[PDB]
């Protein structure tokens, strides 16, 4: 009675997919900084969604509104071949991203790919080549067709294009195209989240709660600071901070250093804090009585307040040595250090209390980047898994699943093509990128 409301919602979906994915593709094409191995795979993923929104979803909406197929038999064997192609090439790309992110975090070059940009193009071509054989060869050679009468009536009729497949195809094609790359993706990327948390480091811990500024700034106390929380001087003079900066770097800096020399200062200060923990008589027994995680929290305090200041927590150092983490967490809260900087002290106290990195989960920028990739994979799973689960259940018990439920679940996977550009807005780098492109 009212197909307009359904038709308008469908028209807004096609527009959101074409606009959103062309926006992602152009950002990677125009900006030199975005040319990376991951964004190459993002382009392959965005191209799959673009062909989805151009050549698949519009004809799928016309098929629903007209209750028939008005584009002929040739286009539908193609429309179905393209539809299966974009879903296969999407899950395989995600599987390649999860595997590529695994080797990046297990390598010494943490968060950086072991592939060159030319190898990434070779993998993408192979992905579409293998996906092309999986999607086109069964459809064009008619390896999918069923044998019953209702299916043969739809094949011989040009105005009917319901996707009837035999049970062997619906079982095999779902497993080889979707389930196998999905299970590998979920398993491998589950390990990336484990390694990111397990390989969490005091150098990344201090980077999180003190940031990085390669130009001179003032900290919460007003003192001049540069790098990763490297105190230059407590004097209000700016030449004094600049003069002390030149002595540490060995160069007239004018208050500006690079990241290569900012980390060298950071590595010096961390070693200075550790060397001060071992020399101090009060901190030495506590440090030897701690695991690697709680050792990092103790160096975090010494990094911020100095060796003499951390030794002042007389009671807290008793119980951190006495393995009584919960009691030490309360005394650490009752301190000027908690009142001064509570968000940092909260993360340190939690580290002392739980002995884990729960307070620094997804705080590092690279770990934020890995979380968004997890949302792309998780949302893709939630949108297509009900459809593919119903595929298998329909094969076992044929009478159970109606086509109204089948089309509904298929379109939940259809709207997934527009979610990727929205999820990429979690990145400040794409956010700046599309602001430039949209001229905002
Ligand atoms: C070595 N070169 C880099 O690392 C450049 C450098 C850079 C920085 C700032 C502006 C520009 Br222009 C370029 N960063 C980039 O290439 C960023 C790095 C990044 C930063 C923060 C986050 C997060 N928190 O989710 C995520 C990634 N990549 C991205 O955003 C990409 C991306 C991939 C996966 C999830 C979300 C975003 C693309 C999203 C879609 C369009 C194109 C980007
Ligand atoms: C038969 C028709 C309908 C299917 C459409 C196939 C198209 C969209 C496929 C075929 C080859 C694919 C390309 C293969 C290699 C690359 C290199 C990479 O840096 C960006 C993506 C890009 C450029 C792919 C995008 C999608 C692609 C162009
Ligand atoms: C296949 C038919 C039916 C639909 C239209 C296909 C379009 C969307 C495909 C075919 C080839 C694709 C291109 C292949 C290669 C590149 C280079 C890359 O650096 C940016 C994306 C870009 C430029 C792709 C954009 C999308 C593209 C033009
Ligand atoms: C309107 C119909 C044609 N749409 C198809 C789905 O969007 C995507 O379907 C699949 C993608 C990848 C592998 C697949 N194996 C199948 C077996 C039966 C039905 C769909 C699929 C399928």
Query: Nearest C-alpha to atom 11 of ligand 3 is from which residue?
Result: 47
**CA 412 to ligand 4 centroid distance, Å:** 13
Q: Is 416 in the pocket of ligand 4 (CB under 6 A)?
A: no
Q: Is 80 in the pocket of ligand 4 (CB under 6 A)?
A: yes
Residue 102 exposure: Cα atoms within 13 Å on the Cβ side: 14
CATH 3.30.499.10 fits 1-200+361-440, yes or no: no
Query: Nearest C-alpha to atom 15 of ligand 3 is from which residue?
Result: 47
Residue 159 exposure: Cα atoms within 13 Å on the Cβ side: 3
* Residue 328 structure tokens: 């030490």
Contact present, 104 and 195 (Cβ < 8 Å): no
Q: Which spans in 32-179 are helix H? A: 37-51, 57-65, 72-105, 117-140, 149-156, 167-174
Is 288 marked as a binding-site residue? no
CA dist., res. 94 & res. 41, Å (int): 8
- Burial 128-167, CB ≥16 within 10 A → b, else e: beebeebbbebbeeeebbbeeeebeebbeeeebbebbbbe
Q: Which spans in 199-291 are helix H? A: 202-208, 238-249, 259-279, 283-288
CA dist., res. 429 & res. 440, Å (int): 15
DSSP state of 227: E
Closest listed residue to residue 105, CA positions, set 31, 174, 198: 198
Q: Bridge-partner residues for 215, per DSSP?
A: 256
In order of 64, 84, 387, 405, the CA distances from 413 in angstroms are 16, 12, 8, 13
201-360 has the same fold as 1-200+361-440: no
CA dist., res. 277 & res. 271, Å (int): 10
Q: List the chain domain ranges.
A: 1-200+361-440, 201-360
* Residue 365 structure tokens: 């920028």
The pick from 87, 180, 390 for probing ligand 4's pocket by mutation, whose C-beta has the most ligand atoms within 8 angstroms, reads 87
Classified as helix, coil or strand, 213 is strand
Contact present, 223 and 231 (Cβ < 8 Å): yes
**CA 302 to ligand 1 centroid distance, Å:** 34
Q: Bridge-partner residues for 227, per DSSP?
A: 213
DSSP state of 56: I
**CA 131 to ligand 1 centroid distance, Å:** 27
Positions marked catalytic: 210, 219
Residue 285 exposure: Cα atoms within 13 Å on the Cβ side: 12
In order of 64, 76, 157, 351, the CA distances from 152 in angstroms are 21, 15, 9, 66
- Residue 244: how many CB atoms within 10 A of its CB? 16
Q: Is 124 in the pocket of ligand 2 (CB under 6 A)?
A: yes
Residue 171, C-beta contacts closer than 8 angstroms, at least 6 positions apart: 392, 395
* Residue 127 structure tokens: 């992905």
Contacts for 359-363: CB closer than 8 Å, 24+ residues apart: 360/200, 360/204, 360/205, 360/208, 361/197, 363/208, 363/209
CA dist., res. 85 & res. 130, Å (int): 10
CA dist., res. 184 & res. 181, Å (int): 5
CA dist., res. 267 & res. 230, Å (int): 11
CA of residue 306 relative to chain centroid, distance: 36
CA dist., res. 39 & res. 18, Å (int): 18
Q: Which technique?
A: X-ray
CA dist., res. 27 & res. 22, Å (int): 8
Q: Dihedral angle at the C-alpha atoms of 371, 300, 223, 219, nearest 10 degrees?
A: 20
Contact present, 98 and 90 (Cβ < 8 Å): no
Q: What's this structure's resolution in Å? A: 2.7
* Residue 285 structure tokens: 């027994």
439 phi and psi angles, rounded to 5 deg = 60, 60
Chosen CATH of 201-360 out of 1.10.530.40, 1.10.630.10, 3.30.420.40, 1.10.3720.10: 1.10.530.40
- Residue 396: how many CB atoms within 10 A of its CB? 9
Q: Is 431 exposed, middle or buried (0-12, 13-18, 19+ CB in 10 A)?
A: exposed
* Residue 171 structure tokens: 């079982």
């Amino acid at each position: 009675v009212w197909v307009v409301g359904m038709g308008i919602v469908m028209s807004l979906i096609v527009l959101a997919i074409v606009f959103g994915n062309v926006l992602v593709i152009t950002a990677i094409a125009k900006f030199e900084r975005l040319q990376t191995v991951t964004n190459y795979f993002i382009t392959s993923l965005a191209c799959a969604d673009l062909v989805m929104g151009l050549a698949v979803v519009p004809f799928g909406a016309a098929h629903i509104l007209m209750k028939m197929w008005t584009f002929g038999n040739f286009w539908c064997e193609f429309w179905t071949s393209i539809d299966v192609l974009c879903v296969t090439a999407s899950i395989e790309t995600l599987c390649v991203i999860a595997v590529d992110r695994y080797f990046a975090i297990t390598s010494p070059f943490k968060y950086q790919s072991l592939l060159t940009k030319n190898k990434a193009r070779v993998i993408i071509l192979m992905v579409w080549i293998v996906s092309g054989l999986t999607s086109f060869l069964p459809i064009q050679m008619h390896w999918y067709r069923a044998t019953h009468q209702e299916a043969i009536n739809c094949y011989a009729e040009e105005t009917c294009c319901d996707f009837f497949t035999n049970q062997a195809y619906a079982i095999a094609s779902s497993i080889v195209s979707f389930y196998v790359p999905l299970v590998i993706m979920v398993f491998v990327y589950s390990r990336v989240f484990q390694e990111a948390k397990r390989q969490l480091n005091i150098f990344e811990m201090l980077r999180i709660d003190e940031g990085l500024r390669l130009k001179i700034y003032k900290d919460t106390e007003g003192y001049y600071t540069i790098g990763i929380g490297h105190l230059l001087t407590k004097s209000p003079s700016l030449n004094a901070a600049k003069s002390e900066l030149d002595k540490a770097i060995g160069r007239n800096t004018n208050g500006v250093i690079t990241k290569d020399e900012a980390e060298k200062l950071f590595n010096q200060d961390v070693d200075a804090a550790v060397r001060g923990i071992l020399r101090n008589a009060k901190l030495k027994p506590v440090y030897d009585s701690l695991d690697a995680v709680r050792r990092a929290a103790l160096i975090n305090m010494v990094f911020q307040m100095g060796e003499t200041g951390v030794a002042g927590f007389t009671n807290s150092l008793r119980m951190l040595q006495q393995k009584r983490w919960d009691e030490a967490a309360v005394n650490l809260a009752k301190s000027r250090w908690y009142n001064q900087t509570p968000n940092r002290a909260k993360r340190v106290i939690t580290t002392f209390r739980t002995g884990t990195w729960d307070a620094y989960k997804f705080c590092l920028k690279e770990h934020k980047a890995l979380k968004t990739l997890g949302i792309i994979m998780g949302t893709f799973t939630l949108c297509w898994l009900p459809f593919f689960i119903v595929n298998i259940v329909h094969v076992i018990q044929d009478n159970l699943i109606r086509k109204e439920v089948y089309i509904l679940l298929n379109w939940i996977g259809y709207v997934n093509s527009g979610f990727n550009p929205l999820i990429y807005c979690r990145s400040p780098d794409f956010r700046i990128a599309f602001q430039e492109l949209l001229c905002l």
